[PDB]
Structures are given as C-alpha cells and as structure tokens.
Design an enzyme around this catalytic site. Sequence first.
Site, short mmCIF file in Angstrom:
data_model
loop_
_atom_site.label_atom_id
_atom_site.label_comp_id
_atom_site.label_asym_id
_atom_site.label_seq_id
_atom_site.Cartn_x
_atom_site.Cartn_y
_atom_site.Cartn_z
N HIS A 83 22.39 39.21 10.42
CA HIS A 83 21.67 39.12 9.14
C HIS A 83 22.25 37.94 8.35
O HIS A 83 23.21 37.32 8.83
CB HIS A 83 21.61 40.49 8.37
CG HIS A 83 22.88 40.95 7.72
ND1 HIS A 83 23.86 41.65 8.43
CD2 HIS A 83 23.32 40.92 6.42
CE1 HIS A 83 24.85 41.98 7.61
NE2 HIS A 83 24.53 41.57 6.37
N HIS A 85 23.88 37.42 5.44
CA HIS A 85 25.02 37.47 4.53
C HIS A 85 26.22 36.77 5.16
O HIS A 85 26.29 36.56 6.38
CB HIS A 85 25.37 38.93 4.20
CG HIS A 85 24.43 39.63 3.26
ND1 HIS A 85 24.34 41.01 3.20
CD2 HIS A 85 23.56 39.16 2.33
CE1 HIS A 85 23.48 41.36 2.27
NE2 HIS A 85 22.98 40.25 1.72
N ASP A 87 29.27 37.49 5.84
CA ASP A 87 30.18 38.05 6.84
C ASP A 87 29.60 37.88 8.25
O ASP A 87 30.29 38.14 9.24
CB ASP A 87 30.60 39.49 6.51
CG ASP A 87 29.47 40.51 6.51
OD1 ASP A 87 28.34 40.13 6.12
OD2 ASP A 87 29.72 41.66 6.99
N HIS A 148 20.17 47.77 5.71
CA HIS A 148 21.19 47.06 4.92
C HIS A 148 20.63 45.75 4.33
O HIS A 148 20.98 45.34 3.21
CB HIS A 148 22.45 46.81 5.80
CG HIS A 148 23.40 45.82 5.19
ND1 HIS A 148 24.35 46.22 4.24
CD2 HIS A 148 23.49 44.46 5.27
CE1 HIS A 148 25.03 45.15 3.81
NE2 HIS A 148 24.51 44.04 4.43
N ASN A 179 27.89 47.82 -0.29
CA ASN A 179 27.12 46.90 -1.08
C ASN A 179 25.67 47.04 -0.63
O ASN A 179 25.38 46.80 0.54
CB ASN A 179 27.61 45.47 -0.83
CG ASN A 179 26.49 44.46 -0.88
OD1 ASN A 179 25.92 44.20 -1.94
ND2 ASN A 179 26.14 43.91 0.28
ZN LIG Z 1 25.25 42.18 4.47
ZN LIG Z 2 28.89 43.54 6.94
#
Ligand SMILES: [Zn+2]
Ligand SMILES: [Zn+2]
Length: 232
Positions: A83, A85, A87, A148, A179
Amino acid sequence: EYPTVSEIPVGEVRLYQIADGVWSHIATQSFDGAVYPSNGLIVRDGDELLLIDTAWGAKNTAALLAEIEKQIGLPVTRAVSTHFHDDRVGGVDVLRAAGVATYASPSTRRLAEVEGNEIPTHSLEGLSSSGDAVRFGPVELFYPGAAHSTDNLVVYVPSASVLYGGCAIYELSRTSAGNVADADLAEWPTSIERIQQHYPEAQFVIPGHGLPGGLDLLKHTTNVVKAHTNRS
Ligand SMILES: [Zn+2]
Ligand SMILES: [Zn+2]
Ligand SMILES: [Zn+2]
C-alpha cells in the site's frame, strides 16, 4: 524465536525463515515516542528473490539489502509495495538505485503521488476490483477491497501456504485499532471475508507488524475493527 523490538537495534534488520524459500524481514522505526516493529516478505524466485515491502525508510532498506546479501546471497530483482504509506514505500529509491524493479498497483502509485511519498516505478495491472487476483512469479497478489487503506494488497505463496496480510491484518497482541486515518472501516470486515474465502488453506499468516500466526489473525482483525467502529 521470532524477532521483537528486543532483538533489533533501530537501523538494523533481521530475517526470519518461515518456510522453505520464504522469509520475513523485520525492522523497527520510532514514531511519536514509541518504537514499533515492521514486517515484510522475501520469496525465492528460482535463483533470484522477490521482495514484498520496504523496511520502512531509506536507511532500514539499505540495511535490508545488505542483510539479504549477507544471509541469502541471491539478487533481489523485483519488489512489490502492498500500500501507499511510508512503511511500505519508504526506501523505494534505495531499491531502485540497487537495480531492483519496484512495482505497485496504479491505485497505490496514485495515492503515493498524492501523499508526496516515494512512487514504485512499475504498475501492476488487473487488481483494481475487489476480489481480483494476479500471479506474480512465486506469489499470487490479491486485492480484497478497502481495509487499512483503499489500495491494500495481500500476498500468498502457494508453494509454502504463507499468506502475507500486510497492514490490513493485525497481530494478536494488537487489541485496539492502529492508525486508521486512511482506512475504510465500513468495508474492512467484508475485505477480510474475501481473504478468508480465497485462502482457506493458508497455514502461516504474517501481519504488517508483530508476530505471525494462523488464519485466526483474520478473525482477530475483524473483532478489533468492529470494536473500533463501535467506539463511543
Ligand atoms: Zn498504512
Ligand atoms: Zn504498516
Ligand atoms: Zn524496470
């Protein structure tokens, strides 16, 4: 024997053999006065390696490649980010510089661009609709629907029955929602059901963060997401 933030100096990465020719990678990152672990996947593809997800930042990701070079000694030829994000895509330039082909869905590429995050180079076609699967060398890529994040993918290794859920799946120790700023809470349980229905045979389930387990991590995540949804 699974590594915890206990056995990992921030800036370093450990590998963990889950099954023959499947490893997880484990890194740590400080965020907001706490230290979190983070998982990705490494899958042997003949005499090369497919990497799933960065190790959450340039420095971590350079340590990941060094540790693969030390411990496996096969080249990483391709990487997939699950995804948009940081990380998962943070460190994509490090991979690129080392000559890895970086991939993500157009959905992920679009969202990373909007976010001002690093953008994997190559596009994964045929994942845009909930329930879509595509074969990618020694794994299947699956888009279960929004969870998520709207773009989250999960990865299955047919030969070892390893399902990598990435951040759409929580470890058992996670008892409250993380989150969820970019999450689709309304669709998350339905997305997990798509995963359950598609991989009923999975023997190992690796969450984005924390300890592996079995398919009850799916039900666990559902329980946690539903509790958060009902928060007062
Ligand atoms: Zn994420
Ligand atoms: Zn993560
Ligand atoms: Zn290329």
